[model samples]
Target: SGAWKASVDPLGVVGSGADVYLYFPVAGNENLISRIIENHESKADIKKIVDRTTAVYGAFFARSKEFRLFGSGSYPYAFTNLIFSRSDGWASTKTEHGITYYESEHTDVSIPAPHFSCVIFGSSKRERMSKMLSRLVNPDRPQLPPRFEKECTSEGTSQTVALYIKNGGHFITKLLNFPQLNLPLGAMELYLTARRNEYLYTLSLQLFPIQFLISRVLNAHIHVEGDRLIIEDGTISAERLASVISS
Candidate 1:
């Protein structure tokens, strides 16, 4: 949880369209970082980049074909340079409204800082990249909902990983192939804390009206507190947990 703090506020830069959010506390936990990088094809490159990063946050816009990643650390210039150096394709770099953008076919990178800073951005589309930078430049722009922002910044600093899903009803219905359920899920938040041999997780779901039988449907010990359904202190081994999350 201590590692969750970043120099820049993540909620400020993220667009309102983002429905899924993933966060990793990358400053410590070398073993966890190594295991995650080992699962990727660009293991060495990723390791080199992550070595300088303190935290990483990702956003997925379910309504659009856009994805964004924010990396926060001390050496923003060096971090930006390392990513630019790794580009082999026809990449172009430019600056607009105090934001430096690296464009390529595979993906686009943006550094929204004029001098020393602690944040960088990655987006799937150049248009989306520009929109994010614009949001950073003009703080008056439309931002994430206040409720979601509160949930994002709420305490749980001891958790190594966190995931937030907005509009969980749609996400869950599509995921479980049961649109008929039509649950009114407002949001879902999951926090996982690493332990000696396993990981413990807390799952919280925001529902407009309580669904009494959801606990039986999910086969979990769910308790209703206010407008939320909470599955508390669920445990799973590291490897199996990772697989479930990635899928």
Candidate 2:
């Protein structure tokens, strides 16, 4: 059978009506990204790029004073390793280490493909950082994870966030009770970051292909800025998004 298609006006994990949903290309770690600190580049060259990239990610964590990981970066909160204990089976995950290794394989025809490793070079609250981490990383089953803030002071530190869906297809399909969007094969490995202005948020989408079909689900103003597919709007809110995650 083919994938199910939705008739929703704008189709996307991040709503169509967001302040900004910028999509950029992720050429994988084989490119200048890895060579920054991997290859025998000059110390100054490596530091120049690495420093800029980490600062870019840290921006998301800085703005998420009230929303937590939802719009700040990383969705669902269950996949992050910042305040909570890091999950099992991660080897130098990208956002934390500035590099990530990944693979997509099917043990069977299971919905979510299997992979290994993901933090990148790589948070907190007015309350103790531990307190907010506990609140978001608890075992209680809330339809959607509560929002909290995380603080990252270092330059190359990863902002305690996990943007891709955990358990991939099975988790989302089961949570939503059905699939809503059909993604191309290359769309699986995803990345995102956000900046907050009250409820007006700017989210950047990476690794996902540029498809007009997905525009409907996203429901945000989509545009291209160099390599980024920018989606901008002001309709994202906790009340509306809570049901989406839980339902």
Candidate 3:
């Protein structure tokens, strides 16, 4: 069915300081998932692992060197045991607040839901992983930026994949190696709907004060609505879009 519906609210577990966040519906969307994972050399291996999940949500906090993945779906007892049986570096397991944490040298996994239906994988830092799990179990935990949340929850076209960058200006400037390219660009939200052989994309860039200048610079048919510069419609082939995003 490739439906976008999921039982888990990814935003609920995501912390407030993530620099990059990505979400995709899993189950019947393997083709779309493969396209998103196109740049990886081990697509076969990655696909094998992705096959076990119903949805995938990822977050990267660059400053804290924290990367987290939330995989939502059922996991059988054997499968759960196999995950912890890895001999690479998974050393110990600890349970707290009804969540079991699997510790390792460079990576850690946590089963935050009962019956192993959902898992959260994070960097080696136990503290960070614990914080993420706490967010999952605690309703008062800090969440993603308010503006990003608003854009995500706004009524709009359903997206097959969504990527959110915390600060557009910082991301662009750092990526382009232009420290002087200063602009009051806020968060960036890219929504992609997978069509037959291409992806229909809607890009929303939050800008303030200098929205007109940014609009002119973009030159494309962009709409300046309130504080955000929006490209409501665009199309790109799956491979091309994948390459562009990967690069």
User: What lDDT would each prediction earn against the true structure?
Assistant: 0.61, 0.28, 0.62
Off by over 4 Å in 1: 1-8, 75-79, 96-99, 114-126, 140-159, 176-184, 208-222
Alpha-carbon shift of residue 167 in model 2 (angstroms): 9.3
Question: Model 1, range 58-147, lDDT digits (tens) per residue?
Answer: 677655556666665544666667666775773656664345666666466665652222233343432456666555544222244343
Per-candidate TM-scores read: 0.72, 0.24, 0.71
User: Model 3: clashing residue pairs?
Assistant: none
Preferred candidate (lDDT higher): 1 or 3: 3
Error of 2 at 172 (Å): 5.0
After superposition on all C-alphas, the RMSD of every candidate to the true structure, in Å, is 6.0, 20.2, 6.1
Give the per-residue lDDT digits (tens) of candidate 2, residues 84-181: 24323333223332322221121000011011111211112212222322222232222211111122222124332223221234333434367667
By summed lDDT, which 10 consecutive residues of candidate 1 come out lowest?
A: 114-123
Best by lDDT: 3
Stretches off by above 4 angstroms in model 2 are 1-162, 165-175, 179-181, 185-198, 204-220, 225-228
What is the TM-score (0 to 1) of candidate 2? Answer: 0.24
